[model samples]
Target: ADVPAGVQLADKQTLVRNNGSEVQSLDPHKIEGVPESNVSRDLFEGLLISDVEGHPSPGVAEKWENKDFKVWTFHLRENAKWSDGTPVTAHDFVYSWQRLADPNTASPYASYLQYGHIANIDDIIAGKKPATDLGVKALDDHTFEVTLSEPVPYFYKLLVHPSVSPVPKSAVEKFGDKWTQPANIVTNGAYKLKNWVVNERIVLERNPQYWDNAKTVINQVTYLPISSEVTDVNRYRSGEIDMTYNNMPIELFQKLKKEIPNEVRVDPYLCTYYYEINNQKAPFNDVRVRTALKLALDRDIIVNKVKNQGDLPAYSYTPPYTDGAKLVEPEWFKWSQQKRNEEAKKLLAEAGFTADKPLTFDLLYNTSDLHKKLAIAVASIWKKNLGVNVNLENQEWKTFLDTRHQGTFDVARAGWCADYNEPTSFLNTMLSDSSNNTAHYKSPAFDKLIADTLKVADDTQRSELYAKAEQQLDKDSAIVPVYYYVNARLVKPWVGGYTGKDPLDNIYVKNLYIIKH
Candidate 1:
């Protein structure tokens, strides 16, 4: 048999999977990261949700319509109910969107509505207007309306993000941040928060009040914050868990594939692993130095030899998974590795670095065995290829996020998984005024190009603008492109309906089941 003989699951109907890292927060408006969103998907339903294929599917809103893709209306399902038995209403959505743009919430994705082109979102995020002025209205108890700054054909997809999910205003107002605590939390999705043992596991049990609870097969779900890929593999192999995180130990992948061919999973993922260079800092502030560093990255070695996980080496920031878009690589993209390294050497020399006075900098990455391995290999390449002296620093996830956001590191590990299936999800991050731009890259020309994108509704025109924006990033050498992500993991044969096909990797445990072997 291709499927391995089953070991009894930890809980007969509970799906246990590694979350890769401890979640920063569980509040829909206060969290960022795939780990948080994975758990949030079970705890909250947005106006829309991603189907197995990453296309928009109806969620809390039973149906929706848009006039010229600008003014959108959603019809809430009458049966939708929160965990506490309160009806999930249009007013709930209105308050949630307002809170996301409140600025006081300090969400990392606060500018998300602006990117979605929601009307007045920019003014609200900028504090030029009150959050109450956001262009969302509850037309009636069952109807919700939103006005966009311009037509966005993919607005439905934007609504599928957790950042835009409706929150319970009553619970939030009463419990504050504690609202997400297991005892006080109220959710509208398939499950409700059951327990959260920090650095260990976050648990959820099926929500009986979920409108579609009868269709949900798993009775419970647990996410373990197992940061080490090796530990995740150990747990999975021992049958202590049902699934492994996406980044398994690269060194063990070959053996795992051979031993558990039916369980090992690798699927297309829309993410880019890169190094954020502090563009405003000295040394890296020089374009020549930045270009030299980027050129010196032997991505082939990193992907083929080091990672060996079918990861695609990235030359541009935007992944090909973006809709209706074509990538525009740098002029040197076609150059041979030898030629690129030669040019890198010349550029560094021109920037006044030599064999005696080599450029030195620290590379920061969040703690993970995979990250450590990749960082060590990349630093080795930079040293061997361009005489660059690199120092590696590792920090825990939360501290690393703050360090990167505060611009306290010369170069830091960064990856962007598309928040929605749009090019701007990645392109907008580097905007001159983008809060997410860790590089501190500022270019008026790039800003103007992105701003012009909002004026067009045609897919071709929008993609063209995105192409220009990506080209500008390449020209500026704003970040180092390492590779495009592939979702690599292991799943138990007994865990049914395991679909990893979504490019954004949105997994809904509601669709999974524990099949007895």
Candidate 2:
């Protein structure tokens, strides 16, 4: 099969078995981004379980009891075993949590764990207390406990996530830092990582020692890094791949939908694509300047031109169908165009800006035709509305992230799809006053709203609190909400059970079984 310039195919067969209930893996601990993390879910089993509806359920721990909503006791399953036939025990979970929380290890997702029920873990990591003093504890080989500083409704859900997957203590103690690098990696899941060639391919094979070996159907799986839309489509068409994920071009999507609608998968992805302003930088440091820049963006034009009627234009930080709550657009868009224009003008004037003293800034974007078109459209709007000449800068994906991490750009175009279903997954990481705050946008009020929401025990009250937090974010204009993503992918007709519902647009291949005729 002829692939596009940047797209590559997996060197081996990859299929989902048991409707993606299980997957083969390369490494459980080294999983970084949503892509690899989801794959890890198939191969690895967390101490806790995620429910059938995708909420946290019970896993290795059959039952857990919380005394006073602080100390949680988990009774582990004696049946679980590592790929190498080592027994899976409470100590493995303890070692995994401690290693991730260790500042020296530097896991990117460490902060996420520290937020809700794991807040006490953060304090322990800061040296305010010992790891034992923090919350989680291994009561014995078959039992474990956790003490939360406060009651958390979603604690179990957080536990089932890959970030909380237990690590074999013996493997880590022996291999140290090398424990996650290829050969040193060990797994207690259904699959073991066989090979990993960075920027190329990763291979996973079914573990004979997996407790549920009878349920395992796939023999081998391979994941190839395909970054180009055309190449992904071409591979699928030529029968070289089982599935090709995101980055599909709109033209290809339309053509495929008509040509092979059964193979064309379209779903409302749980991703909110938006623009961010570098608040720490000049011009953007001024709230009025930021407001003017946001106002200058004609979202409707961008949607029609670049997005091509597939995505919905967003007016709020949270997506419309978040948690089954329809985010009302009419009420949000009640401010007429004339009113918005007047407000933009007033904000600019209040900041001491005019046609002559136009606010000058640069708009940075990645190397996509759609992104460039959106950037140019926004720049045009700024020049037209506020008489501000916004310069456009373009870079590759890796370069864009590097510069954004270094805070080297004035205004950057970036989008964060949700890591999990929660609003905090998107808002907290980008807007919170932490190292993960990439945009450098912060507000004391915003911080308080997040804090307050987490403390509330009532579900209705918590929802209201999150809504208030989102409203505060909207008022602050911390980020320019562009549109909520609606992902469309092309799957071969033989590919079965590939339902795309992950809020993060992560492809779960474990359950994806190929129909062999």
Candidate 3:
């Protein structure tokens, strides 16, 4: 293990984390991107946080309790203080949670409030009640209460989401949209956002005033957008960057896992990579044609041959791992590749498509070399198996997200990672009202299963409901599942406290320490 070519540990103690995907927004209430979670996670703690491994651990709150799984209470630490040295309290969280649901705030992720089943939130979102009517209450300076309309056993697992994190009123009122800019945001976690430039890099400096300052270890963090995957890896090789998080090419990931010894890492991420069919549109609106296209895919080939790195072929919208729950995927088209294709042609012909009048549409994807390759393979499969014509198209990530949101294309690549470690994190998005439901999918009878999830506390009952929700996804032809994601990365051995696989697989700067080799 004496390959000493990479960057040596620095005396100043910085973890240069390599990343791309320009953070969409830093406003906790508005951010919808998964990477944005890391921003607020580093800057502020909610009632709880996931530790070195993504397990629920006390943060601002020293302890918490639930009675009958309906109402939960938290005890905040008296010593916790914001970067501005003001005492952190339950009121800060209450203010942030209420503002998130305020109609004036226009928060995109306000659904976190809904998923949590915050009492009276339905009335609040419908404009029938005030934000004050929302469920969170600050009983005193250090005590907070969360009342759920229904019992949620896995509720504690959800507290780490950024939308629910505490935000100071003074900062939001003073800086407004500019609050997330450096020198404006006031926060209470171990790291402070010290500098930022759009699409370039962000610098986070360790907070000396953190509540656990005595134990907090990481000093400075240089986080940046990859710009390109090749250059990022070259930087990693030449000792210029320490590690990276989502920028590795699936191609090089396989090579690096062998070429480098102990540095390369890979694990199951609770994510599903798929394509969204514009269900409101012409050909896709016809369920027979939609189901026909899905039947044409050879998922075994997609995972084993296309994405040869450790990836699981996904048959269900939710990944196999559902935080210890079983989803009984329906046995549909469980046949050989030839049999699947034969059935697909039958369905396509029944949908009034033929070899002469072939069903054709544009296949859209974000501009990733890997995603482009994936689409190419899929398009070939469609053409060869079902006599379908797919015009390949791609745009940069931001523009692609907008395109999908507008429902301007036929089929577009999409991926969803769990916001929290629960089946609802995957199931809830298909709700007819979800802002993230870019497919414009609608089915009231199917929606009932997901709606029933919030009220059901029995494991068997909830699991059955979630299974029905996914089965409905197959029935509606809402999406085409391709592969389950594996998070592969390279990290220097000197980096500590990031050795375990958690839900998000994120390393907190507060707990990360460097050991001189």
Best by lDDT: 1
- How many Å off is the CA of 367 in candidate 3? 2.9
Global local distance difference test of model 3 = 0.80
| Ranking of all candidate structures by their lDDT, best first | 1, 3, 2
Q: Would you list the C-alpha lDDT of every candidate in the order shown?
A: 0.88, 0.66, 0.80
Query: How close is every model to the real structure, measured as TM-score?
Result: 0.96, 0.84, 0.93
Q: Looking at model 3, which ten-residue stretch has the lowest summed lDDT?
A: 1-10
lDDT string for model 2 (331-429, tens) is 435666556667787898898987777778778886655567667777777677667777899875556665776778888887766545666665567
User: Candidate 2 regions off by >4 Å?
Assistant: 1-13, 16-32, 49-53, 65-69, 125-127, 130-132, 173-177, 324-332, 336-342, 349-403, 501-507
TM-score of 1: 0.96
Q: Which sections of candidate 3 miss by over 4 Å?
A: 1-10
Cα RMSD to the true fold for all candidates = 2.9, 6.1, 3.3
Which pairs, if any, clash in model 1? none
- List the lowest-lDDT window of 10 residues for candidate 1: 1-10
For candidate 3, lDDT tens digit of each residue in 1-517?
0113454544767878775567767788877765677666888788888876688889888999998888999999999999989999899989999999887887767777888888998788778999999999999999999999888877888888788888889989988888888878887888888888877788899887788888776788878766456667778888877877664665576778789968877776888888889999998999988888888888888889877877887778888786845876556636787887888899999999877888989999876667778899999988998899999998866677778778898999888888788888888777787756788898897779888876666777888888888888988888888888887777887877675578566557777767676
Q: What's model 3's TM-score?
A: 0.93
Check candidate 2 and list the clashing pairs: 16-512, 19-511, 20-510, 20-511, 26-193, 49-57
Error of 2 at 277 (Å): 1.9
